[PDB]
Design a protein around this nucleic acid. Structure first.
Ligand SMILES: [Zn+2]
Lengths: 155, 24, 98, 80, 127, 206, 60, 118
RNA sequence: CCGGGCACUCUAACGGGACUGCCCGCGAAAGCGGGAGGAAGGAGGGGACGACGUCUGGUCAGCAUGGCCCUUACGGCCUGGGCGACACACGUGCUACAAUGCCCACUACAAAGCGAUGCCACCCGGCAACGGGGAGCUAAUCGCAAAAAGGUGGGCCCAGUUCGGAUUGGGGUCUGCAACCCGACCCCAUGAAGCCGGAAUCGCUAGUAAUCGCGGAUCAGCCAUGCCGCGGUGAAUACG
């Protein structure tokens, strides 16, 4: 991005819920190219909440995920002494993706054999403020602020 | 797994025929 | 009724090299089978430029034997004469069958 | 592991001057380089002068030492 | 009574015949849900006939063959999105914003020397 | 080197191959064997007339030496004299027997290769290294040429100092894969180390 | 490569298991293409004009 | 359940539960459920009394195993020793035998990396 | 499939289409914001092409080529041996550590190439590599080939495990004068390390990375996981 600020890729509206950001999630499980399996993988961890519960995973991903979405983070920074950590108001598109870059990561970490489970079972704990991901997100929302000791370099 | 000479992808990798790798 | 194959080296040489072997017989044997295309097959060699090391630059080399067809439909000796040994082309060769 | 099939091969440099030798209690240490000839039974008594690419080496053959090829016992290069 | 709508994509021919009233697909046999095995991404070819409401009102005969199925659902897609205007060159309103009318540029690249994957360059150690 | 060879770069674009025969396969490997067995001499002994292009005709058994030669006369020979003393060497190989036919070359000062060996003979001459080159670039230049370039290399005057001396004029656009050009290369075995020279010639263009 | 080895341009080895191709001109052994019976080098500089009819600088 | 020479496929599908003998691999594994005809699936925890006996009886008699097999091999090697055949020569120094380079690699038949200096 | 018919695919061969021209805002202008319509853009995407010169970069084992030097030999000829060692260390990769996985059974879409004692449909002996006999092709119209991933059903249940296949014993097919030194391949057995890798560190901005599978050349068969290409499925992200 040294010449042009670049431009964001946009996608199709899930052949299901009718949303695309989820296309991403469904693709954040996508691994190796086989979104085929991953297609369902997500989908099922839904009808396994319509099999394991009776509330369509709409506010789950929603109200939950957006929580796993870091309201603020820390970064490096060099001057005359070193690369001092800096607290700064996170981005949207960043905060955003990190929702999933964290779901699918600490979500496949949870030991529940089949992809599906870990999936459903994660959105779960997520849509409750508990379990895997939310730590990191917080872990850092917490990291930042905890490092509020740095602001001389504001940004 | 790819060297399991005696498996599908085994003879399907090395690219050969044997007991496990049939004709049809 | 008169199969005429002719692979080649040039696209409209060959193409034309027989395109003279067409419409005459479209008023002699009855008609023709038209200037028949036919998918062309190729060869390649891409090799290491200059000996020793380097490699990575081989440079590519094609070569096409463009198989072409035009087949005159139905003889008639009028056909056999209407584009008989009534030849002309050089860059191409021909296979005669029926 | 190993394989010959229908028509095992014994070099007729030794196998040849082997059949003849035998006729008196076998010869007395053949000299044919041939270290690529299947070891054969009747020999069992001889001694082989097989090459080493520089050297010729002793090999009093046996029937047990048969399913072999003269120099599988003829160690080429040199180690420690 | 009859209309048309061809379709190519990523290398996959696929004319989308259509004699309205409904729209039962018949790709090389296997009715719609048999050729492309209910893979989430196959309910996308007819996607165009879904923002026009024709869907259950425009019968069609879909056949196709040319490389790989992931694309075919897109190849065919063209005509099933092409039909609604072929005969109805009016339907270009609830057509455009969806670009189901636009061709699919995306294609495949090709391996040049000093490479592994048409771009995937090897590696070196210390430098 | 960081260049190619426009001749190669320029084939189906403006320099149609020297050889013509088709088919190939069980064939090709020989047709281009003998083909390259006639060059051993042919356009070598007869270079003293036009060692330019050595075009070949064919159709199997239908050999030919459409060979182009500037000096249309150290050949043909009074109605057909050399055009035989050599058919008798044309068929000293060709079991197909060719229809040999010397070709009338125009201003040699437009025939790159010609110049190459030219300035080359004119380089074995020790005679005006560069000056000749300055001449060359011009001859060729004024003799119609729209561009002209010559490039001797490796040792000069026996310079124990290997070097490459430039020289061209008008305009010599290569990259313009189209405008058509022309090239040529020769040599010069020396009492100090064989070297060689190029020879380029842009022209009408298109 | 040199002329101390043209005992194959003939093809008469001694067995069906001996035929070091030898490139027409290059004459070396290491790359003797078949379709042209010469060398990978030969392929380049020659085809580089009209010494490989039917050829061309391959691109696509 | 002890089938072959001191062996015990327990709670694990008889099929492979047999490849638990220095003489059985998934090849002979089925050639058992054959001349034996036993329902291959169903764990051993369901294996009848005369069934265990048959393969027991068909396997112990049909192939040379464990003790016998093990030490039989000890011989071949023990063989290639006395006999100058290279094969022996290699088991002699504890290094590859059928056809490998030995500049590098072969860490398994040569043992754990023994570094030096140069 | 036998007619029957080019409207459709593709076939190789021509030419048409895009230029910031139209749309409207900034500006002196280039042109930049966005839109119109367009199959498409603001150089559609990918190549082929690498300036005057640079390090005396690389090769005289391609050949050539100035000269130095041995010449019953610092040519050669043949069999044999070596280039393939090995206490080790580096480079690039293959395979895998697995359950988004491995395995079996039934079914489907690749494009580009390739084949005359040369690829080889089939019937049939063998568990098998392969053998014996044989249909069409001179190759859009026969075949090498079957694509695999994947879809469907089902076997495994978190195990150094039906993961993974090193290594090793034994029998055996094959080219071939000959596979001990060193040939691939197939069958049985054996089944090793490896539960994702210290510091450090390599690739890619899209149909690319990733994953899957196909052919090619040299080539008797072959140490190819290499190389040169095709294509199937198809991301992430770039504040600055
Ligand atoms: Zn050569």
């Amino acid at each position: 991005a040294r010449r042009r600020r670049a431009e964001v890729r946009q996608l199709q509206p899930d052949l299901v819920y009718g949303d695309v950001l989820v296309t991403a999630f469904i693709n954040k499980i996508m691994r190796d190219g086989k979104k085929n399996l991953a297609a369902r993988i997500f989908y099922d961890a839904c009808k396994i909440i319509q099999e394991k519960t009776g509330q369509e995973p709409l506010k789950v991903f929603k109200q939950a995920v957006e929580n796993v979405k870091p309201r603020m983070e820390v970064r490096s920074r060099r001057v005359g002494g070193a690369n001092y950590q800096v607290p700064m108001e996170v981005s949207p598109r960043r905060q955003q993706s990190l929702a999933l870059r964290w779901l699918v990561q600490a979500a496949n970490q949870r030991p529940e054999r089949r992809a599906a489970v870990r999936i459903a079972h994660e959105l779960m704990d997520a849509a409750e403020g508990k379990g895997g991901a939310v730590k990191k997100k917080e872990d850092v929302e917490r990291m930042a602020e905890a490092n509020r000791a740095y602001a001389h370099y504001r940004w | 797994g790819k060297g399991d000479r005696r498996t599908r992808r085994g003879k399907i990798w090395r690219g050969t025929y044997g007991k496990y790798r049939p004709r049809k | 009724k008169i199969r005429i194959k002719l692979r080649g080296f040039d696209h409209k040489t060959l193409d034309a090299s027989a395109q003279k072997i067409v419409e005459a017989a479209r008023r002699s044997g009855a008609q023709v089978s038209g200037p028949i295309p036919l998918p062309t097959r190729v060869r390649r060699f891409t090799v290491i430029r200059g000996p020793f090391k380097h490699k990575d630059s081989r440079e590519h080399f094609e070569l096409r034997t463009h198989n072409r067809l035009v087949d005159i439909i139905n003889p008639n000796r009028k056909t056999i004469e209407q584009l008989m040994t009534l030849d002309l082309p050089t860059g191409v060769e021909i296979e005669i069958k029926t | 592991p190993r394989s010959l099939k229908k028509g095992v091969f014994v070099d007729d440099h030794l196998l040849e001057k082997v059949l003849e030798l035998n006729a008196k209690g076998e010869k007395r240490l053949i000299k044919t380089w041939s270290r690529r000839s299947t070891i054969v039974p009747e020999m069992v008594g001889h001694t082989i002068a097989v090459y080493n690419g520089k050297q010729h080496v002793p090999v009093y053959i046996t029937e047990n030492m048969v399913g072999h090829k003269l120099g599988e016992f003829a160690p080429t290069r040199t180690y420690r | 009574e009859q209309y048309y709508g061809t379709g190519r994509r990523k290398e996959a021919v696929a004319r989308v015949f259509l004699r309205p009233g409904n729209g039962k697909v018949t790709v090389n046999g296997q009715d719609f849900n048999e050729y492309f095995q209910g893979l989430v991404r196959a309910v996308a070819a007819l996607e165009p006939l879904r923002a026009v409401d024709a869907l259950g009102r425009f019968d069609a005969y879909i056949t196709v063959r040319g490389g790989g199925k992931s694309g075919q659902i897109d190849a065919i897609k063209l005509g099933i999105a092409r039909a609604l205007v072929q005969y109805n060159p009016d339907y270009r309103a609830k057509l455009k914003p969806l670009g189901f009318l636009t061709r699919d540029a995306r294609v495949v690249e090709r391996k040049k020397y000093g490479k592994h994957k048409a771009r995937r360059a090897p590696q070196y150690s210390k430098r | 080197g960081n260049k190619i060879h426009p001749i190669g770069f320029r084939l189906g674009i403006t320099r149609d191959w020297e050889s013509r025969w088709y088919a190939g396969k069980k064939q090709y490997r020989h047709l281009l064997l003998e083909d390259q067995r006639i060059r051993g001499l042919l356009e070598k002994e007869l270079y003293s007339a036009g060692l330019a292009r050595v075009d070949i005709e064919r159709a199997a058994d239908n050999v030919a030496v459409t060979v182009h030669v500037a000096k249309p006369g150290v050949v043909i020979g009074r109605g057909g004299e050399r055009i035989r003393v050599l058919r008798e060497e044309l068929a000293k190989l060709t079991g197909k027997n060719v229809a040999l036919n010397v070709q009338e070359v125009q201003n040699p000062n437009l025939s790159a290769p010609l110049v190459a060996q030219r300035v080359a003979e004119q380089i074995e001459r020790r005679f005006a290294v560069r000056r000749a080159i300055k001449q060359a670039v011009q001859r060729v230049m004024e003799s119609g040429a729209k561009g002209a370039k010559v490039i001797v290399s490796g040792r000069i005057g026996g310079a124990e100092q290997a070097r490459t001396e430039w020289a061209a004029q008008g305009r010599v656009p290569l990259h313009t894969l189209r405008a058509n050009i022309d090239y040529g290369f020769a040599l010069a075995r020396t009492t100090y180390g064989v070297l060689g020279v190029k020879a380029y010639i842009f022209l009408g263009e298109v | 490569a040199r002329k101390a080895l043209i005992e194959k341009a003939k093809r008469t080895p001694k067995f069906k298991v001996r035929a070091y191709t030898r490139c027409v001109r290059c004459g070396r052994a290491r790359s003797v293409y078949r379709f042209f019976g010469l060398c990978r080098i030969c392929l380049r500089e020659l085809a580089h004009k009209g010494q490989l009819p039917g050829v061309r600088k391959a691109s696509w | 359940a002890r089938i072959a020479g001191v062996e015990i496929p327990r709670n694990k599908r008889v099929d492979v539960a047999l490849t638990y003998i220095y003489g059985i691999g998934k090849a002979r594994a089925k050639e058992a459920l054959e001349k034996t005809g036993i329902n291959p699936a169903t764990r051993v925890k369901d294996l009848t009394e005369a069934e265990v006996v048959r393969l027991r009886e068909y396997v112990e008699n049909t192939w040379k195993l464990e003790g016998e097999l093990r030490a039989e091999v000890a011989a071949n090697i023990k063989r290639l020793m006395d006999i100058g055949c290279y094969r022996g020569l290699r088991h002699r120094r504890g290094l590859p035998v059928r056809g490998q380079r030995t500049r590098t690699n072969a860490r398994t038949r040569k043992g754990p990396r023994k570094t030096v200096a140069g």
